[PDB]
Amino acid sequence: EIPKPVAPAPDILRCAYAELVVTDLAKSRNFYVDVLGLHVSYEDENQIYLRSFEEFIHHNLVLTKGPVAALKAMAFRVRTPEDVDKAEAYYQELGCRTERRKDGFVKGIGDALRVEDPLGFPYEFFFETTHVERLHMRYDLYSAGELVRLDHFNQVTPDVPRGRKYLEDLGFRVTEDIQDDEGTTYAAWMHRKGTVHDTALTGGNGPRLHHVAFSTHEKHNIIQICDKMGALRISDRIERGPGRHGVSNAFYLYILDPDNHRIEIYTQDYYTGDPDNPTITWNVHDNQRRDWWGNPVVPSWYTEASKVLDLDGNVQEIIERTDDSELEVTIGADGFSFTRAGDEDGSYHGQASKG
Template structure:
């Protein structure tokens, strides 16, 4: 039986014999690499680190690592991997032991992606495709190449948001890997009946590296990328509209209650959801306490801004299994939209 939210928060993150630094890269499969290149490079302005006939390796303007977004030509759109960077290569060995104890299938690869060393790949008990690595090639930061920058500009990858029907169990899994909770949304009522609708968990001292959203899953709800200031979000919307791509704007601009982020959600040509994200806050103090939001609070999902469309709750990127097939999904037994009163989503 899953722990209650109170029990989960009282348990807190497990002490770990390894150090997961942050969310580091995502690999997305796309059906038309040229169309994806136009969206991510020409319109959003990401930096191309390398390009092959079937893949594109991208990074943000301040990033020194070789890539944070990998786009790969494929017959079906899906998320192939969610990558996390470790502080040291030796951390991978202790992590492998812990993951196996948590019911994950794990295996090793070496040099599977350009400029990367050995990596630990895992399929967690819920179906999410994870990868952990330390070694990756470094390139020059383009932070101050103001003469070249395009788009918002996007500076770096920030987080993954995962659609999960098993929120409490998934929350506990990430706590077992040493992740801390910054904020969460839950239903009202007696503690034993309280249910999670959303949760934000972090390793770096920001609001999150992994967020959980209640819904059909396992699926990837979105990839969050960090931009320097709210004006960049607005500038991106103007640029997309001017390029005839305004339909890519799914939700926002607006400000979240949770995280305080100024945001806009975009859909790429394959429907993968990208969040441009800025203005969150520091969580690095050891006594940081999780902030609770009631699911009935109209400010939790949107402090201000238009109501989220149904697509934001119902559509997400499906995941690839080790056999190259899509991972089956299951519906959640609670709909956040039905658990609230007149609420802006």
């Protein structure tokens, strides 16, 4: 349904940064800098530019003060300056609204193209960026919970197959998905950089941003984030986890920022860079697909997500999913999940796992 342009797709390297609108810059600074330990590349009264421990581009996260908390831009770095031209022609062919600024939208980025994409998301494509001191060996700064890289974005959208075809045309390769036996797709993960993903589509009402994810080196670094949150008596801002994912095989944690923006901490997925990387499809009723240990997924994880803005800074209208709901079919009143396919023992009827 989204047509494949004649124009060549831009060569996209990876997810690079997100710009998030926040309502209280000081509260958000405390969360991202004092709790999570992200490093400040630049800040003033209106914005905070933050980067992970191993990054050399200017930033991985921009917090911009504004009236309505929302995603303003999800940015991907492209391989060459000429790929920004290619992006612009590609989205024009798709009949999408675009805006190009030779000196960038945010500090530390040069020539950049922002677009309202066919799923209603604000994508940015850029090459030029101000290099900063790469802190990868600054063990004098290293926190027990250190965030080392930006890993991926996750987007909520009502029609996953529609979105998947579009991202595949753009060069993303699907690595894992969740489907049922009746032709419904609930989620898909897709990559450029050779990890399990750079973005993912989660079926639900949208456009909304589900989360932004950062990596740590080791599993104990994620445990430390939880332990620190207990010590600060903000354990209520731990939403889900820590756990092992089924899809992706990564160790994970979901926490909530002061404006409820969801942040995932993630580590130790696998290499997907080969072009015949085997795709893995999970059944939606498999209770090890999201948490490998079978821990229940809290309904807020399925229902809550962040608003996204269009290029004028207004919130995008939400379009309702009409396909089956992953919440309803697994943990709702008529839901079902299994531990072992075909075994009644360890299955759950009309409720979540573990009691």
